[PDB]
Design a protein around this ligand. Structure first.
Ligand code: CA
Ligand code: CA
Ligand code: CA
Ligand code: CA
Ligand code: NI
Ligand code: NI
Lengths: 214, 214
């Protein structure tokens, strides 16, 4: 056979129990003799030692503890298949291990209180300010790092409830109604939220304090 | 080479864009020969058709749409390597595709209101009732389907505030303090929550209405 072996992918933060089986290594030369399996590489016999191991006679590749993609995202190991002798019956097997992402991190606003301001006179649709939240998880290939922005509430509610809105992706807060008026209401506190999985995940909260100018 | 090909794991609910590369199929007989690649299997050339595909010359296995583990958890496909001359140059390659779980589902109480009852005289630690919330995601291999239960609030708060507890995993509501008395308080309404990723995920909410008997 001359197929190139593909990588295996292992989701991070797996549930117990450990150790657990990933895949079974096997040379088909064991229709002939007994075979002894082993592994090498960082993650196995060099730092970080003992993250993976293999059952010498079964060939089972074992993971000994939960992985964290944000700590190490990939491993490069090698499977070795030996006879009673000690002598190779295969060239070593490429064991590329890709740690795939889970939503093990909540999103975080870059500050607890954002300040901005706007002229009472501006047209509906004008930008006021921009808020940011970060999420350590993969936002490129998965939604676990993708933040959706929302306004939870506005104090005060004068002259009404919906003076501002927020762009769900960019975090840019804009004016959406007439009626801003410094003399009447000089300042608003907006309770803002960021939610991962583009809305379907967990939510964290902060405020944006918007000063009205004339 | 005679190592057995491992399965590849593809996380579900992948983010755009598509198609996107999974792994590159390759026969090292391409030192000798011009190779044409193809794949067959359900998910490829039979229902559901065209979920996967392969680039004829590069050998890249492609995914053409986001997978959903709770729809199809696993695919079994075959890769073929054919020479310009028409010869099949390998035994077809086993392409086992494991669709690994993401947290694409919120926990759901099996009903909005649970009704139970208990005698006023019972000892601390007596069971009252059991409430259930389900989660379509994997709870064997991941925390995404693992529900943690909690009591948000007890109304009313006579005589005490922590009259009941709820078991974190089972959803069994227990009495934990003396002082129950139907003539003083005939009913409690417990606001109860179920939260996936074993409490670090999304929350949902329902009511346990507990009748007190004498
Ligand atoms: Ca996240
Ligand atoms: Ca993560
Ligand atoms: Ca879930
Ligand atoms: Ca799922
Ligand atoms: Ni071979
Ligand atoms: Ni972390």
């Amino acid at each position: 056979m001359d197929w190139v072996i593909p990588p295996i992918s292992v989701p991070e933060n797996g549930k117990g129990p450990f150790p657990q089986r990933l895949v079974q290594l096997k040379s088909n030369k064991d229709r002939d003799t007994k075979i002894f399996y082993s592994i090498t590489g960082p993650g196995a016999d060099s730092p970080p030692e003992g993250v993976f191991a293999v059952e010498k006679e079964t060939g089972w590749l074992l993971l000994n503890k939960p992985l964290d993609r944000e700590e190490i995202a990939k491993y490069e190991l090698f499977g070795h298949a030996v006879s009673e002798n000690g002598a190779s019956v295969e060239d070593p097997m490429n064991i590329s291990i890709i740690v795939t992402d889970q939503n093990d991190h909540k999103p975080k606003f870059t500050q607890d209180t954002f300040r901005g301001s706007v002229l009472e006179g501006v047209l509906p649709g004008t930008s006021v300010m921009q808020v940011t939240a970060t999420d350590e998880d993969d936002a490129i290939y998965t939604y676990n790092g993708v933040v959706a922005y929302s306004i939870h509430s506005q104090e005060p509610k004068d002259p009404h409830d919906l003076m501002f809105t927020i762009h769900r992706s960019t975090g840019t807060i804009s004016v959406i109604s007439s009626g801003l008026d410094r003399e009447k209401v000089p300042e608003y506190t907006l309770t803002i939220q960021a939610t991962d999985m583009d809305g379907d995940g967990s939510t964290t909260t902060a405020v944006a304090v918007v000063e009205i100018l004339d």
